[PDB]
Write a protein that binds this ligand. Structure first.
Ligand code: TAC
Ligand code: GDP
Ligand code: MG
Ligand code: NA
Ligand code: NA
Ligand code: NA
Lengths: 33, 335
């Protein structure tokens, strides 16, 4: 049903793309789980 | 073969399901952005407030424009390390200027000040910034245009002559929809011809229409087997034109990926594989660039011997004797 959207994290090494990636996942799960 | 290193996660907002891709190093970002190994409807540019924009910050924005990434939202990270409203506004301004330098609307770009780390730790003040970022994903990025809603296009693979029914071309509907009765232009390689769809077949059985993602056969009116060939595309009339010269961004495979072992200079004449076939071309390197090393990525102006139907965003492989040595994407058609 829901609209599917492709996104991703870009930016310089060590600026926190992977940490942000996990942070989004956990916070959306705890807020909209 | 190109080595694709990625991290895939999925997450949901009340109204949307997101497929998120993250990559390890800069080379992974180059490769994966050019090959389309992850198509971003929108990108989240992460900039550490502590470093401010850095070389890959600029290159990813540049690559994003060249490969067609339509929207960029910024997440100014590590703000837990920077308590200085003036420093934060400085960096944000630097980022908007950088985005604009590459034609993204820096002034209209959402920028969220956060801390991925403290949010990840369970700090509510920071978690709120993540929700804010997700809000902008929801609000700033429009519902992407679905494949079926785009004009019909089908890369021609085989060409059959069929017993009394007519000429039949096969391939996978790359986009759109083709219905019996609709007109179609056969574009690329030769002068554009026109014809009419008198039938769509799939799995031996006659259908009413073919759809994006499906492998079908298209019966054509009046055209003969000799007038059509592989490399050409079927398209809703007036939606795609053939071109010989274009500007592109390309990634040359590294030695470790089984690519070339030496640099090539101007005068390099490889094959450019577009959809279904190889087409030789001549290259023009950017000003000041004398050679291209395995592993490098550059803007390359290409001139094909024979035309090909194309538009910005079309992917292609660069090959040497059927062996892939590079990947590219059309950034701008020239003519
Ligand atoms: C535990 N910590 C968070 C990880 C780590 O130890 C890292 C490191 N430099 O030591 C990362 O860079 C680490 O944080 C990180 O950024 C990682 C990645 O970016 C990726 C991506 O994007 C895709 C596939 C694989 C990786 C990865 C294995 O390199 C990731 C490892 C991450
Ligand atoms: N203080 C602080 N450190 C952070 C934050 N986000 C990431 N880091 C740290 O920055 C380093 C690199 O982060 P990482 O996600 O691997 O960066 P990446 O290479 O862009 O994926 C790690 O030591 C992280 O813990 C943040 O918001 N605040
Ligand atoms: Mg990372
Ligand atoms: Na720093
Ligand atoms: Na939201
Ligand atoms: Na030289």
């Amino acid at each position: 049903t829901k609209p599917h959207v492709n996104v991703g994290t870009i930016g310089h090494v060590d600026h926190g793309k992977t940490t942000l990636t996990a942070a989004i996942t956990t916070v959306l799960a705890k807020t909209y789980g | 073969g190109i080595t694709i290193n990625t991290s895939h996660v999925e997450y949901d907002t009340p109204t949307r399901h997101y497929a998120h891709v993250d990559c390890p190093g800069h080379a992974d970002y180059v490769k994966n952005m050019i090959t389309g190994a992850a198509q971003m409807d929108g990108a989240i540019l992460v900039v550490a407030a502590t470093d401010g924009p850095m070389p890959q910050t600029r290159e990813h924005i540049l690559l994003g424009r060249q490969v067609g990434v339509p929207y960029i939202i910024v997440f100014l990270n590590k703000c837990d390390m920077v308590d200085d409203e003036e420093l934060l506004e400085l960096v944000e301004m630097e980022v908007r200027e950088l985005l604009s330098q590459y034609d993204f609307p820096g002034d209209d770009t959402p920028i969220v000040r956060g801390s991925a780390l403290k949010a990840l730790e369970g700090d509510a003040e920071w978690e709120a910034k993540i929700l804010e970022l997700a809000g902008f994903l929801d609000s700033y990025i429009p519902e992407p245009e679905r494949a079926i809603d785009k004009p019909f296009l089908l890369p021609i693979e085989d060409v059959f002559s069929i017993s009394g029914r007519g000429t039949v071309v096969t391939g996978r509907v790359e986009r759109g929809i083709i219905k019996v009765g609709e007109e179609v232009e056969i574009v690329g390689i030769k002068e554009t011809q026109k014809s009419t769809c008198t039938g769509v077949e799939m799995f031996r059985k006659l259908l009413d229409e073919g759809r994006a993602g499906e492998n079908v056969g298209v019966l054509l009116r009046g055209i003969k087997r000799e007038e059509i060939e592989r490399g050409q595309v079927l398209a809703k009339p007036g939606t795609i034109k053939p071109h010989t010269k274009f500007e592109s961004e390309v990634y040359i495979l590294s030695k470790d990926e089984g690519g070339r072992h030496t640099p090539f200079f101007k005068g390099y004449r490889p094959q450019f594989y577009f959809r279904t076939t190889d087409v030789t071309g001549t290259i023009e390197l950017p000003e000041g660039v004398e050679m291209v090393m395995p592993g490098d990525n550059i803007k390359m102006v290409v001139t094909l011997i024979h035309p090909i139907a194309m538009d910005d965003g079309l992917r292609f492989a660069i090959r040497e004797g059927g062996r892939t040595v590079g990947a590219g994407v059309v950034a701008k058609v020239l003519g």
